[PDB]
Amino acid sequence: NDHQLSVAELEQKYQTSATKGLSASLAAELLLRDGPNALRPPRGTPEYVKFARQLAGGLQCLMWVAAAICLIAFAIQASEGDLTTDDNLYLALALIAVVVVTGCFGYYQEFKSTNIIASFKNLVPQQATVIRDGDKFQINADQLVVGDLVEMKGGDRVPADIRILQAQGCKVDNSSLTGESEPQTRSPECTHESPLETRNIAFFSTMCLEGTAQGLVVNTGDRTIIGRIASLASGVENEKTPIAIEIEHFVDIIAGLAILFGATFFIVAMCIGYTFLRAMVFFMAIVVAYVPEGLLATVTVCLSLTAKRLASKNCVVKNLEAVETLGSTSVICSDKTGTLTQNRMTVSHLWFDNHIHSADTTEDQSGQTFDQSSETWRALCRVLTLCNRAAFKSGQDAVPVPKRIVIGDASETALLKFSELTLGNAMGYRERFPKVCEIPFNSTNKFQLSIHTLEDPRDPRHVLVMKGAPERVLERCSSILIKGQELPLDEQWREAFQTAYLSLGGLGERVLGFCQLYLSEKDYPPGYAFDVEAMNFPTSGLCFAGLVSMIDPPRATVPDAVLKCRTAGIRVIMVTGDHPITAKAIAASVGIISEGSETVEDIAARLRVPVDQVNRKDARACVINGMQLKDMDPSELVEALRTHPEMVFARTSPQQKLVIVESCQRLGAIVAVTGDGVNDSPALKKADIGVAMGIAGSDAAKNAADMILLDDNFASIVTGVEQGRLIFDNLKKSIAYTLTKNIPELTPYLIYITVSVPLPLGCITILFIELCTDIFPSVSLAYEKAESDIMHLRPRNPKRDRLVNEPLAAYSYFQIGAIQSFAGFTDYFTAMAQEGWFPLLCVGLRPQWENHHLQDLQDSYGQEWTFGQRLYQQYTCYTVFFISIEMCQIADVLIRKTRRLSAFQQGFFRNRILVIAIVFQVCIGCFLCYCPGMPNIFNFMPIRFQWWLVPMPFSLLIFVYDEIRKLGVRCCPGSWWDQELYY
């Protein structure tokens, strides 16, 4: 394209001038023809649309349907003949209010997260230098058009996609756009065929680090590379979260059970002489009854508590559903530059005394240092400190050395920070050796030189320090400083040097050679006139000091975080735009490639055979570059992914990152993506959960992400995985607890319709159970500790391991809720008989009992009752059934603390929140029972003490039965009992 074309071939497509630029009129016409040089802002979404999205979801839709059914049944009953139909209105209002309040809470969570994240986004106007009809003036960046001749210098952001016409030592920072970590040279010569790998193209939004450059604007606005990436990210659709899928599966289970029960009892009501309309109303009532009211609030509160715990560790989720995806994650596709690494060149290895040392590269310097007690080291440190022009910006003392801002090149910055960390007071050491001559780095010499004076006044010798490319230095330096002695080069030092240089290069590191040469007093006395244009000073026969290599090193917590993720069964794949050698070296450093793992190239090198001769099954590690990936079909990509457990993708475009994520998801995996730059925004959007760095992350990446690491701490991924697994287990427990009580709320109504006993439980007291007494105990189960080493387990199978499954539903409903129903009916019949109504008289009593025209109905003793007195007795039955359910739910919350361990093992009082929730539940029950006015406000009665005691043996039975079940599970793993009775 524009980079493969010549200056003659160009300068006519855009009607411009390589020397004079564009005419002003033509620039105006082009600024009309195309848009301003900027990216269109995202369409966004109105705040009311964002709020309305919170009202959707599987559980919300089930509740909306239930409310609609309530209203339709109300219409039928009111249109036929029926009074006392306020229960339908109460249920519909409760459902709608829960949905709306939960939506408001989720909207508040999203608003808070968005504000916290956007507080890190600032705004600065952008201006550019342009040349038109020979003039040169500073114009706004969005005013530029295609064909504009522009000027760039060090420290200025590149204003558009530019084909470089002339350059003088120009280097750019492409780390956000590509994966490249080192500064890249821009030259006016084409060096590749892809525009993303050629040195004659500068990219919009990148930073010019040093030097000057001129060129023509060849792409603008959304047609730039970053604009194309943004457009690609816009076309990626965000799929539903694993937790949302689990909730939808749970809704399917609930709907199936509701329909089955409703149809069965519709048939029963037909068989016992009800009309079709009444039986249909009964079916609708049962279907609505199976829909839990407070479960949505409980789930939302649990997710919010997990989000609060994560935010305590500077890990912010943009939506509540994202707090579980890491727990479900089986594959992590991680970006390298800026995500696994610090995106900052740092001294890593030093070769002196015929040995390769290792420097501390951690940003907090909490690492392993090297031996700094050698004469060769004390000379090498002096050389690298003196032969350096970099300088810190003033006013930096409390800022740590790695994060301090310095003025100079990346290599000189790394050398200066290394001097400050190892020697200390590099500025003082440099000023104590005054400089009398200096030669800057140039493309021909490929070295930098300077002559200084020694600190001690006794010594008049001038020290010469030289820094440059390793071979361009070793061509000089006939002597070498070994163990504090100046040895000559006997073809053995020249091969040790070559081996060290090749090893450092193969470690993906940039190497510099250092040397010194003290000047004799006779030949160069003090006051000697050193001339840079005469080369009077000696430039050969120096004393080689050592090699220093630099790399963009991993963040401090990254290697241990990767190790923990792999221990948790999670596959970690590096996907980077950087070069394969650096990518492989970093992958080995951070544990993505294990010690001893080899690629096919490594196996071939060891076995002295061609690559195709080896077996790809023997190679655990694999490195695939973007060019190989482009010629790879999905079948072969899947084959490579399955064949090589430790995988590195290098030279990977944003589209190719998207393709890799899509392939991993197509294999059935739940995929997490961690990235920082614009090049991983599409992959971040496509991932099941996108994680972006907060400090290092670009705006596009943070917008695409679901989770933001504010402090750029990668171990927060491990924290997220642990919290996700814990919240999955605890949500399972909380849901089982919530579902248990639905059966004792429904069975009294079924008995009321079919057997015609006086109503044992009212709609108001059911609402109190659902929304006031059990929400706090259900939420308190979110504080349960893990029952095993949750971080040594494999990720759950998404197809088989469901949040709510058949054993959980069947146990919670038809064993525990059945016991609770029996307790409730025992208390019901006790309270009825002790007040004069025997059970057999209760059977079939409903029409007379509810008849407003009967004011002397006889009880079992022949006593005559008014309707009001019978109604107060009915409220007493409501209260005893309520208290039975509450007493059994205390034991239920006790047994839901664990799924396998005993309550004695886990601890009864370890969950202080659970203990407080139990106390609060009992207190609210007592308040409802014995507050004055309750019989006529909420229809709760001041029941006698013995009706508190009746359900207690049933609660004890619940606890004992669950303990025996879990003991059977623990003692007989793999048995029929474990397969059928464990949830």
């Binding site: 058949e806 038809f814 064993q815 059945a818 016991i819 029996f822 009916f825 025992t826 019949f829 006790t830 008989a833 002790q834 007040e835 004069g836 025997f838 059970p839 407003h852 025209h853 004011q855 002397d856 006889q858 009880d859 003793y861 022949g862 006593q863 005559e864 009752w865 008014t866 309707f867 009001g868 007195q869 019978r870 107060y872 007795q873 007493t876 006529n936 006698r944 039975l957 029929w976 059928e980």
Partner: protein
């Protein structure tokens, strides 16, 4: 999910074992529930209820009981006999259970005092109940007037108190029925009533009630209120209260506790 080999994700043999487990579980739970009910009924006293929390004051009912849409509403036409034929039939059917043939199981009662019985000295291990016969209602007994005064415009209303085991209304004087206009006619005079038995009292020897097992022949004492100055072609509200020391009629949530309130309209 359904398949020949593994039906609903479970083999046929496994379905047998899981169904057997659930059957055993429900049989055990039903047995526990039946045991609890058996223990309850073994601890229940057959003659006296354990508690009377909702029966602190007796309800009051009225015959003939005709309801509108908010309570009792009686409306007929002295000219048109078919309007009160149903009312007089209701009164006749209610008083059928107070004939001497229906009262053969009770004994004569004259003490005018609490019939406290601490032993089972009646036949078949019961306690004595005292007779109440229709002729105690004099003109409102259905003879010699089979219309109960509805034809003449002075209808009889039978007022009966709900019976409560061992309840005592108070022995300083017999409990008494008092009927009056709820809101007195600003033009007409106050309600004039003639009561049968005289003074509208329930004799104290009908109390206490010992329940249906001890007194299977018990009959609630009755008071007949003959209303004598009801205006014609006009809605009136009548309230009949029970006057006794232990009977209260101030319950805002039960309008039948201690009193009965009906609407009355007599057309000419």
């Amino acid at each position: 999910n359904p398949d020949t080999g593994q039906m609903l994700g479970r083999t046929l043999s496994r379905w047998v074992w899981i169904s057997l487990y659930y059957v055993a579980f429900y049989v055990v739970m039903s047995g526990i529930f039946a045991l609890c009910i058996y223990v309850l009924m073994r601890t229940i006293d057959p003659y006296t209820p354990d508690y009377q929390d909702q029966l602190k004051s007796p309800g009051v009912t009225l015959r003939p009981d005709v309801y509108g849409e908010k309570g009792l509403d009686i409306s007929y036409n002295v000219s048109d006999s078919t309007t009160w034929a149903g009312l007089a039939h209701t009164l006749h059917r209610f008083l059928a259970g107070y004939s001497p043939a229906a009262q053969e199981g009770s004994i004569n009662c004259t003490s005018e005092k609490y019939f406290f019985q601490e032993s089972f000295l009646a036949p078949n291990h019961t306690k004595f109940s005292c007779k109440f016969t229709a002729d105690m209602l004099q003109n409102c007994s259905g003879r010699p007037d089979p219309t109960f005064g509805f034809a003449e415009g002075k209808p009889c209303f039978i007022i009966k108190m709900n019976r409560i085991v061992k309840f005592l209304p108070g022995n300083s004087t017999a409990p008494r029925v008092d009927c009056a206009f709820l809101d007195q006619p600003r033009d007409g005079p106050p309600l004039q009533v003639e009561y049968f038995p005289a003074n509208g009292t329930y004799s104290l020897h009908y109390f206490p009630y010992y329940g249906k097992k001890a007194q299977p022949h018990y009959s609630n004492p009755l008071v007949a209120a003959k209303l004598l100055n009801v205006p014609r072609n006009r809605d009136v509200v009548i309230v009949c209260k029970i006057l006794a020391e232990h009977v209260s009629f101030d319950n805002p949530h039960d309008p039948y506790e201690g009193k009965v309130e009906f609407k009355l309209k007599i057309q000419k």
